[PDB]
Structure 1
Amino acid sequence: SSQIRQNYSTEVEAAVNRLVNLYLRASYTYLSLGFYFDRDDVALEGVCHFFRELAEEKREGAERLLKMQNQRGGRALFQDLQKPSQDEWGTTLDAMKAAIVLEKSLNQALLDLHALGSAQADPHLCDFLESHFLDEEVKLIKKMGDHLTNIQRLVGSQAGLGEYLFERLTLKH
């Protein structure tokens, strides 16, 4: 079975499975970003903690999508998870730029799935995305952009000093 599926198209079902893969990929990326900043030759603990908390948030997003797939009577299908795009992530600036690229891509996939649900006249899907993902993405993207601007201002002629100071005074708990 399902004995429950109603108004839930095969197109939406497959798009949700692809979205789950995207979120789990993003979680993996953030795991790699976090452990890079924990290297003794990088050693930016606030930066590590920022990214490790994003890995957890993206995992949680995936899990919420999978719960919804089952609540609608669709079938979760998992694919391989590709490794992150880089093995070494550069400076905090490079990392924050990569993070914003990633979140914009997740946001665009959410918007695409919202448009498909609106084409499929699936209001439960659209509300689901609206309520648990779209505003979260916009808030996160704003925070990233705020961080980017602050990092950029700190580079100066004194890039090491600025990278330290950002980690100490903005990020670090």
Structure 2
Amino acid sequence: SSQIRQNYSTEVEAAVNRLVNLYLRASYTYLSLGFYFDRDDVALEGVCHFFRELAEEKREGAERLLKMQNQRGGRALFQDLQKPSQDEWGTTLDAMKAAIVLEKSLNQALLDLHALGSAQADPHLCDFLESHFLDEEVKLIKKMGDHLTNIQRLVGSQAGLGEYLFERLTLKHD
């Protein structure tokens, strides 16, 4: 193993490596969601921008885990990154419902790793997770929850106008 490793289990090392793949795959998904709203036949700039920023955020989440792996003396392993589940993502409502499901599963994975951390008695991992990932995740899912109920009230009324105005007044103005 390596000279610096201390109270870092193979069970956690392997789970951190699996979580890096999940973050990296969420990133790839948001890259796909963002460039779909840039198509000339979808053309919702604010929505493209929303998903592109989250792509970057998840890539950074994966790098932060990758660096931690190395601080603890673990060794990183990279697996294939499955392409995003869909190639066309629908409307803003369909894309937001897809994104919150995605975030929810990333959050479950953090929660599972944290439970491992405490089972393994690793206070540093538990802290690392609580400090950088657990709250960010709770805030993001609430933002997305908020966006869903606002898209749902607009789109119920007049779907095309609703999508344009949400993108216009919430995503290009908040």
TM (norm. structure 1) is 0.99
CA distance in 1, matches of 2:71, 2:12: 13
What is the root-mean-square deviation of aligned Cα atoms in Å?
A: 0.7
Secondary structure in 2 aligned to 1:39?
Answer: coil
- Pairwise CA distance, 1:157: 3.9
CA distance in 2, matches of 1:157, 1:48: 23
Secondary structure in 2 aligned to 1:78?
Answer: coil
Spell out the pairing of 1:72-111 with structure 2 (5 A cutoff). Answer: 72-111=72-111
CA distance in 2, matches of 1:88, 1:116: 36
CA distance in 2, matches of 1:28, 1:98: 14
- Pairwise CA distance, 1:123: 0.4
- Pairwise CA distance, 1:18: 0.2
String of CA shifts for 1:35-62, please: whole Å, max 9, x gaps: 0000000000000000000000000000
* Mean CA deviation greater in 96-105 or 152-161: 152-161
- Pairwise CA distance, 1:100: 0.2
- Pairwise CA distance, 1:156: 2.6
Q: Which runs of 5+ in 2 are unaligned?
A: none
String of CA shifts for 1:65-93, please: whole Å, max 9, x gaps: 00000000000000000000000000000
CA distance in 1, matches of 2:14, 2:111: 15
- Pairwise CA distance, 1:103: 0.2
Deviation beyond 6 Å, 4+ runs, structure 1: none
- Pairwise CA distance, 1:155: 1.1
Aligned-residue sequence identity (percent) comes to 100
TM (norm. structure 2) is 0.98
CA distance in 1, matches of 2:133, 2:26: 14
Secondary structure in 2 aligned to 1:5?
Answer: coil
String of CA shifts for 1:21-47, please: whole Å, max 9, x gaps: 000000000000000000000000000
CA distance in 2, matches of 1:95, 1:54: 13
CA distance in 2, matches of 1:135, 1:29: 22
String of CA shifts for 1:106-150, please: whole Å, max 9, x gaps: 000000000000000000000000000000000000000000000
- Pairwise CA distance, 1:2: 1.3
CA distance in 1, matches of 2:50, 2:66: 25
**Which residue is equivalent to 1:52?**
52
- Pairwise CA distance, 1:172: 1.3
CA distance in 2, matches of 1:44, 1:33: 11
Q: Which runs of 5+ in 1 are unaligned?
A: none
Aligned length: 173
CA distance in 1, matches of 2:156, 2:23: 35
Secondary structure in 1 aligned to 2:117?
Answer: helix
